[PDB]
């Protein structure tokens, strides 16, 4: 809330320039970096690409599988025209942890790798002269940050991550960097909620400032047709005839926030929006008044060498195969994705389940979690990172649900307070009040889950026919799969149900007949017994298979080459239980 | 000569503004696009990334397949600022044909689809205001043109390319696009060249400007001191104790290069280059005067989804296998390079011979090649294309060697008197006069080859073992080999020999006891056996395998998916024979 989450603009008020490129890196595994004057410039750097993640580029297992400080450095130019102007340094993320330096000063600290860092420069910048960042970056795992988990020393002292999720840490810096130039009152944040009226719809939004010169906000058409204006930094734009935001089917407005001294323009912020409603009705997930059955995947930010790297390329390819499936809807397990991704889902009319890093909340690399000392500094940046993602995402119409937290304990009343304070955060940052949830793993029996009444609607995560009976147990895996249906039917909390996660580890080109386990057979048949039982329940609304590709994990005896439950292969082909969802989906 | 092949720097006198992200594109199968105003704006366009080939993204064969006219569109906000400036497009490249359209004007052309492309926008460009580029590419095949081949045309109407070289036709816009603004009168080039005397060493230059204003130039070493100051557009810098640019130990200092008023500077450009010599002297190859035996691979840039599209990533996951390798060496097989290439190169201190995209000069889907009514045309862009490549690559210390065909027929008159202008346009354009050569194929018989005599060094491409008595005639290969080797000797043209191609098709995975074509292990024989023969002549002094990574091809009856004579597969990870390199270049 101290500083703008907007995404860079450039025009008349705003300037931006990328520092995307190749870096400076050094490790600093003795930890030694900051009494060494590191701050200062790196003594022994090796050269690194921004945006990526670090680890996949080297041939060495300690390189690789680094745990501890590492630090970043480039040089970049200003401009002298930004002079007097509020200068920041944008990272699209600090992987996990970091410290801003900028010309030899420390500008600001950051925790949370998923989200924006903004470092005001303004004091320190040097316009018409070259510049330096140094950013000292530290990638451990602990209990008190998400996502959750433990950080092993072996016995020569060097560091090893312990996730308690499953997925590679990949760390550094992942996303795009700039510089940007704002004007000294600026639009810091807005919010927008819809209204629909019959053929008309009603924009109601609030804007931040950082002064307090007049707001005068218009909203333009796809065309750039002005269709309302007002002034003030609360309102309500009405259009005529609304052209709404609709599934596989974008429509995008453009509201422009203008700061004026009656005189002039002080500052100018553009974005697309799309005038839609979600909301939850009984069993229905309502878009635009309307029940909508969610068909997709959960996806990871995840590619070959790149790691969790931003490319845009990878953005139209999974679009393209999302497209391809019939798929509309994708959650971003298990972290806030690129800013990127929402924007081309806006574009592409794709719905998004927003996933907060709430991952690894149940101790094993019950476990007794949510009773630890440290869990009260869990919550807080549990509570910190989800004000970030709601601030940053809220205005995508792509945007129709916040999930915050991935297969935690819930059977206890601890979990339950815990969970009660981060929806009641959630609820009052998202100035729509959008539906908010939870993926459920097993163990949160209904019997025995104290947390799914604090959900809009129920996510839940589950492995019948592999991880539980399977293979020549599957239609023993089909009888208690609905049986537990059985149960929550016999709750009837009138509540939907979708399923966020379901899956089989397939190996490209493995084949038998009869299938096994891990065949590209039995994965048809997997799906296909359990969407005989998703198609037996009413209140059933969604199908989230997991994963849309096979993604890199920790290395062990379970993972071959990470997680081969992909539709997709890692380099984005369809395995044959990918026609199986384009045909149901069609 | 007709632009500035610079690459793009931002200081105080010359600013850019990348133009990389999502662009709008259309498919022109009915080459309507002109007169229906496309260079307005595209009527109906999708979503498409800058860089990267455009091919792999789509899903159906119609788009991944198209051959002929398609179109580009980006909008971007120039400053206020550049309001009294030279404003000029670059494009990295432009696959292989285009005229570059801004704000509605026709503002250039350009044929040759793998170095830069300016495009001058001053007249027509709106500082302060959001302005329109449109690109119209076309990416078909002839014989007048570089690289060789062929447009077929099915009984639909559609165009289909008929490539006469073994890569995927990838096209678009392949590599970074900037907006650049240079002051009125700037530095358009400049060359360097040097010589070693003892401890010391003379930088000799030339300098090119667009005025007739006072140049001077300085030399910075790398913790940026100044070493050498001179005045003039043509001079001489000394360097005490100068720090040679080595073979895998690269040292830059950085050249400055001023126009200046008497009382002020009106352009500074800087650039990083490394003090080296390059010669040939009998059969040894001298760098610093010292021989230095050639020993890595051909590449490409090829890489999944992003086809030849450039990424940093790819740039630095390669050299870290080159380096594991223990490799010194690549040829920009079969086209020059993204310039960020070279870049790395300099940096890591290894040698590269830059290729022409002069393959695919024997018409196949003797063929009397050079007799064509068409020769004369092709002899204008190859030439043209060997002098945009000089002039944009002479100044990396890592440049090497001039490549000027790969696998052409040589053994008439014709093909001598062809490559003899080609020959001599390389060295007149060349400051340095450095090494020049060719890739020759086996037809190229030592007693009928013609062009030979025009080379400083030989570079061979042989299959013995391969596509020559491959398999059970394994030891067959091997007498022939030495034959023709025997032959080459008896010639005793003291001249170096340089093995730019060899290899097998290799499967990953793919294990046979005892082995055969397309395994793992057989791979590793032919390896043997080929430096077996290597290992016998004095006078070869280098071997580059083909090829470093599996890469895409046409598709056909002899390529599974792509061609697999990579040591890595195409997400980069090593094959048996890899080792084998390992130890051996160590």
Redo the contacts between chains.
Sequence with gaps: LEYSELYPI???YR?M??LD??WKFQFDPEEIGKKSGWENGLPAPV???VP?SFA????DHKERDYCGDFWYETE??L???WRNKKIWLRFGSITHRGTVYCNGMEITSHEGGFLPVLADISTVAKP?QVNQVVVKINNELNETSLPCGATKILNNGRKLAKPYFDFFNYSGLQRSVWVIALPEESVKDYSVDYELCGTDALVKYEVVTTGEHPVIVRLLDAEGELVAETEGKEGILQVANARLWEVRNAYLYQIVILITDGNGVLDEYREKIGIRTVRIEGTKILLNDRPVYLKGFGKHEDF???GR?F???????DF??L??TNANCFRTSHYPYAEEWYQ?AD?EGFLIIDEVPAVGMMRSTYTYFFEALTVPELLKSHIADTEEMITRDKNHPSVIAWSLFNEPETITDYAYEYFKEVFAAAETYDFQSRPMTGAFEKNSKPELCKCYPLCDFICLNRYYGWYISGGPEIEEAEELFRDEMDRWKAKELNVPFVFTEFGTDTMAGLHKLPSIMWSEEYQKEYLEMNFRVFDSYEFVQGELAWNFADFQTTEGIMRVDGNHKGVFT???QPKAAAVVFKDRWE
Tied chains: 1, 2.
């Design positions: 450039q025009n008349e300037m320039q990328s490129g190749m050269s690194m690409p990526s996949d580029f080297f041939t970049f130019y401009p002298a025209e018409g070959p060498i790149l790297g490319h845009w390329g990878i953005v139209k390819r393209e195969c497209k391809w081309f574009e890692r380099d984005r």
